[PDB]
Amino acid sequence: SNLIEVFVDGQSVMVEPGTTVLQACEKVGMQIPRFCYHERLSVAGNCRMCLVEIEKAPKVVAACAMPVMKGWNILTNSEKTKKAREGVMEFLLANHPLDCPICDQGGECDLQDQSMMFGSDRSRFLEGKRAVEDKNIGPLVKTIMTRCIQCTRCIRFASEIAGVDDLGTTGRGNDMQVGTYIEKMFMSELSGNIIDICPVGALTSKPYAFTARPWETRKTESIDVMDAVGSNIVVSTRTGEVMRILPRMHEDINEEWISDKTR
Amino acid sequence: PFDNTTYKNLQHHDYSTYTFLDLNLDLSKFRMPQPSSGRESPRH
Amino acid sequence: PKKTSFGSLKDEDRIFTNLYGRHDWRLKGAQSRGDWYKTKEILLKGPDWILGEVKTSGLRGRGGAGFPTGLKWSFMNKPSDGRPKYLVVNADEGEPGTCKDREIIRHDPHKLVEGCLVGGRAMGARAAYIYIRGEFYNEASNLQVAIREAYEAGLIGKNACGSGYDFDVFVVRGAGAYICGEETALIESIEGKQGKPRLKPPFPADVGVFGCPTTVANVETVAVSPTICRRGGAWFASFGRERNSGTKLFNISGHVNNPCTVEEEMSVPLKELIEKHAGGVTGGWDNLLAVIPGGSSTPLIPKSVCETVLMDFDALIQAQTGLGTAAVIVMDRSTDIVKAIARLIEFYKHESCGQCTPCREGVDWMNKVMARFVRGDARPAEIDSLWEISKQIEGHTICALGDGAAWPVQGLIRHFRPELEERMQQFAQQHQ
Amino acid sequence: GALFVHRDTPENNPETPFDFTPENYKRIEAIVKNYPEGHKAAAVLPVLDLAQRQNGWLPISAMNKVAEILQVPPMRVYEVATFYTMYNRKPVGKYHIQVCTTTPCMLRNSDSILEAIQKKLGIKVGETTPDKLFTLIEVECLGACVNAPMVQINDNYYEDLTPKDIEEIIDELKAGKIPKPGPRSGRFSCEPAGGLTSLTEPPKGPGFGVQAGL
Numbered sequence A: 001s002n003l004i005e006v007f008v009d010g011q012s013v014m015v016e017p018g019t020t021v022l023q024a025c026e027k028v029g030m031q032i033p034r035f036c037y038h039e040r041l042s043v044a045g046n047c048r049m050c051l052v053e054i055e056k057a058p059k060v061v062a063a064c065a066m067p068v069m070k071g072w073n074i075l076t077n078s079e080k081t082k083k084a085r086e087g088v089m090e091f092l093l094a095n096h097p098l099d100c101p102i103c104d105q106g107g108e109c110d111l112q113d114q115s116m117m118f119g120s121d122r123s124r125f126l127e128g129k130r131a132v133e134d135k136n137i138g139p140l141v142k143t144i145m146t147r148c149i150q151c152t153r154c155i156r157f158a159s160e161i162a163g164v165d166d167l168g169t170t171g172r173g174n175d176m177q178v179g180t181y182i183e184k185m186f187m188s189e190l191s192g193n194i195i196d197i198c199p200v201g202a203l204t205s206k207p208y209a210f211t212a213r214p215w216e217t218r219k220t221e222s223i224d225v226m227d228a229v230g231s232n233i234v235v236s237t238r239t240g241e242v243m244r245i246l247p248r249m250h251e252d253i254n255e256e257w258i259s260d261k262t263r
Numbered sequence B: 001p002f003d004n005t006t007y008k009n010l011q012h013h014d015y016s017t018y019t020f021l022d023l024n025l026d027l028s029k030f031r032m033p034q035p036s037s038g039r040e041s042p043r044h
Numbered sequence C: 001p002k003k004t005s006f007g008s009l010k011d012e013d014r015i016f017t018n019l020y021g022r023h024d025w026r027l028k029g030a031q032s033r034g035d036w037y038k039t040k041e042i043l044l045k046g047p048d049w050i051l052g053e054v055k056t057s058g059l060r061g062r063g064g065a066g067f068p069t070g071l072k073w074s075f076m077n078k079p080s081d082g083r084p085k086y087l088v089v090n091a092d093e094g095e096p097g098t099c100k101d102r103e104i105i106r107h108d109p110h111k112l113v114e115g116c117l118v119g120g121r122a123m124g125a126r127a128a129y130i131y132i133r134g135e136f137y138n139e140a141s142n143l144q145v146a147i148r149e150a151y152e153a154g155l156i157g158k159n160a161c162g163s164g165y166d167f168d169v170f171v172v173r174g175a176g177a178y179i180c181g182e183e184t185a186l187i188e189s190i191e192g193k194q195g196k197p198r199l200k201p202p203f204p205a206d207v208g209v210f211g212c213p214t215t216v217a218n219v220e221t222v223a224v225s226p227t228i229c230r231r232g233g234a235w236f237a238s239f240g241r242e243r244n245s246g247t248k249l250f251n252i253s254g255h256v257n258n259p260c261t262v263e264e265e266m267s268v269p270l271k272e273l274i275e276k277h278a279g280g281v282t283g284g285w286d287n288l289l290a291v292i293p294g295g296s297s298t299p300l301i302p303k304s305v306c307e308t309v310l311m312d313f314d315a316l317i318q319a320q321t322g323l324g325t326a327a328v329i330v331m332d333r334s335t336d337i338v339k340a341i342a343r344l345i346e347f348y349k350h351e352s353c354g355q356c357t358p359c360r361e362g363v364d365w366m367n368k369v370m371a372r373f374v375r376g377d378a379r380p381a382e383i384d385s386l387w388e389i390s391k392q393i394e395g396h397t398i399c400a401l402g403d404g405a406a407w408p409v410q411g412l413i414r415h416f417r418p419e420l421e422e423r424m425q426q427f428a429q430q431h432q
Numbered sequence D: 001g002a003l004f005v006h007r008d009t010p011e012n013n014p015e016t017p018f019d020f021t022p023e024n025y026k027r028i029e030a031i032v033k034n035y036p037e038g039h040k041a042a043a044v045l046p047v048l049d050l051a052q053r054q055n056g057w058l059p060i061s062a063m064n065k066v067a068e069i070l071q072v073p074p075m076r077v078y079e080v081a082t083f084y085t086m087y088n089r090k091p092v093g094k095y096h097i098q099v100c101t102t103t104p105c106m107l108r109n110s111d112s113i114l115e116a117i118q119k120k121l122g123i124k125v126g127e128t129t130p131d132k133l134f135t136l137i138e139v140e141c142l143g144a145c146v147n148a149p150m151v152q153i154n155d156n157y158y159e160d161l162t163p164k165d166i167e168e169i170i171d172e173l174k175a176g177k178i179p180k181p182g183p184r185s186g187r188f189s190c191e192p193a194g195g196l197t198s199l200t201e202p203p204k205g206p207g208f209g210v211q212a213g214l
């Protein structure tokens, strides 16, 4: 009796109060593009890649943050929605370095994949790009922060999941940087999990560096034995050798995290 | 004596580094008791 | 009647009658000019009566957004739950060209303090936090002193004005950030974080400072409300056109003979405003080029539109610009119109908080492109590229600082395109 | 400084000595009692600025101390320290000159005010004289546009400047005097020059124009 009715592309879907425009779209199988939003972190709404048109409303709303109102018709493929995504992707790639061949994220990068699916196919940026200092946050996570897109996922995860308030943003405007300001190591039993939430090559696995590409690895779904939690993991192999360990989602056990000893 | 000819906001030529924060300490006795969220901070 | 001509505000109908600080700004002088008079009677009328006078007066936010204040302050007139409620006065005043709120603070501090009490009463607020930019260290100190005199006189604090209502007025100094003037970015700065706006919803009326119902209001909007209650809403609504009522504080700076803050009626012609008060455009009216009519955030207009434009919210909207803070900047014919606007985009690139992508990356992008249009180091096709970029920023950001970085660009491209294409021509022939 | 990362040096490291003076602890207590219980973090900006007023600049050990007093994670104080521009993370001169150069001040020849200071002191924008008595930076609008061109030195505004006036102001500062703030042209505040076009009549006393029913 509490569920309200909203439409996605004209199609009725019954959702409970508090459901966002992004979550109502999941119910009809439409995945809205995203960067800053992560369903297990607090909503941020800063990347702006989830902007969607609402029928009879002049202004696009952020799907990851906006609560859905009764009777709204979400236009996930209108021209206004598609021009919003195109423009946002243009700003994300304006300062992004041409690192894909040398970047470990290549081949499993959300910036790459969503640029193919929702962005333009060419550049009209004629300036010089921004460059950022590299940070040293320990021997597990390699930082190449010129690739950072300021989504703030790592900050939110470290604060809320890991309970470490050591990652933050310093500076302002275009030269806003993610880091620790001081020379500090983000040593935490869960620290390696910022490699996976980071949607780009800004945070990568130092042990894994350069050894493999995502398309050439065979995925074996298995279990972790480093402790008694039995976290569900994926073992990545290539030509008969173990390449890395990744989390596998299990809501009732480890959600989508693993410990640094498992990783 | 109605004189619309001289500047009168001249007290601010003697303010000092702690002028603002001295006053805030001086107003502290008049203020009402602040409300409480029920916990010592968000991290408690 | 319905006077179709406006201006010529008489000295008896002016609210900020100590605008120039030639009369004592302390409590003794303020009461001699009307302040703190019959405030107890106003408070005992109640919030519904107070909000009635604000609505009838048609008062609209002087902070630049220009919303109906009476409707805005009514979101706080709801039954309380467990949380306290607050009034946040926006004394940040960072908009280039704007300096009206500075005068009110250091020459009429007691009008602001009474506005806080009356306005706070209307909204059921338990205190007012007055957020004043850190650079205004002497103006904040003046206000802090006037706050002391009100406390010692029973005008604020426990049992304010003898009405049995408990109210607090706090002053909080900023630390340097134009973005903290944005209503939500101000709240986050009061709470001790970086001045980064929040997404809406929730709205501050539901979730504001400390997570409690809040209303953020400009210094000038609060400062005039007590007078609207004493003299009535109808008196205030008697000025300016319909839906554009009241007096207004105007700054006239740039290329005028006598730059000055001044009060004048809403909907006064822009030319009449400049000529009578400011002393005309430097070198005569025929030396005028373009005017930014409401601080940097608004588009510039050319000399042709400036002939018969009125200074009100709706008259400037149909001129493709906005009243903004009503900070009129004048640029005469010797000004490099491209270089003036390039420095504004540089201001925004320096103020962007970096939170959201279109403004973090886009405004910095428009700054790089404008830096080249000043030298002429580009080709004409980049003008339409810059137009499209400004539209990708506008309406896609979290807050309105992104929109205000774009509008200066759109104004320049709208009215001075031949100037841009002309300057590209010279650079090409010189270097080729 | 220009960089928003901190590298320890012999002059600025966590062991660099800082501590509030006992009067400043009294001042902090009053500051903290301005906010609801359970929201002490709201005092980060004022208390962090009180560290700068006592010491002149914010060393890493000052921010680490404000983190201890307010019990907020240090990284949340580093974020605040680097976000706002009024905080000095490098030592400045005794007198910090801040010339506004945004468009309204630029239109009224804020450039010449900047050239005079540089010639008058022998430094370029952003530098600190060998005296360690003068620092120069351009800033954004300071809220005194109608009194352009204007400069701020520490906490005071010197307005309606000309190349002569700014040279005089430094002359006093070098001499140890205390130059009077405010406009240097002839007017006192923001009224039009050469006379007033408004507020020439005496104001009306209490009770004026008050509607009925009060």
Ligand SMILES: Cc1cc2nc3c(=O)[nH]c(=O)nc-3n(C[C@H](O)[C@H](O)[C@H](O)COP(=O)(O)O)c2cc1C
Binding pocket: C060, C061, C062, C063, C064, C065, C066, C067, C069, C072, C090, C091, C092, C093, C094, C095, C178, C179, C180, C181, C182, C183, C184, C216, C217, C218, C219, C221, C222, C399, C400, C401
């Ligand atoms: C970047 C930015 C800066 C702003 N600065 C100010 C300001 O300095 N003073 C102000 O009153 N409003 C400012 N505003 C508008 C406020 O967000 C808000 O609309 C205002 O405080 C409401 O006051 P009012 O309703 O009384 O007009 C700014 C908005 C933006 C986006």
Ligand code: SF4
Binding pocket: A096, A097, A098, A099, A100, A103, A104, A105, A106, A107, A109, A110, A111, A112, A147, A199, A200, A201, A202
């Ligand atoms: S993060 Fe993605 S887009 Fe950027 S260089 Fe790496 S693979 Fe390419």
Ligand code: SF4
Binding pocket: A147, A148, A149, A150, A151, A152, A153, A154, A155, A178, A197, A198, A199, A200, A202, A203
């Ligand atoms: S480092 Fe990665 S997760 Fe952190 S803000 Fe940058 S892109 Fe987002």
Ligand code: SF4
Binding pocket: C179, C196, C197, C351, C352, C353, C354, C355, C356, C357, C359, C360, C397, C398, C399, C400, C401, C402, C403
């Ligand atoms: S538009 Fe600019 S100032 Fe506003 S939230 Fe986005 S990045 Fe920050």
Ligand code: FES
Binding pocket: A033, A034, A035, A036, A037, A044, A045, A046, A047, A048, A049, A050, A051, A062, A063, A064, A065
């Ligand atoms: S996913 Fe919504 S703004 Fe980032």
Ligand code: FES
Binding pocket: C096, C097, C098, D100, D101, D102, D103, D104, D105, D106, D140, D141, D142, D143, D144, D145, D148, D150
């Ligand atoms: S532009 Fe310099 S004080 Fe406003």
Ligand SMILES: [K+]
Binding pocket: A105, A194, A195, A196, A197, A198, A199, A200, A201, A202, A203, A204
């Ligand atoms: K990654």
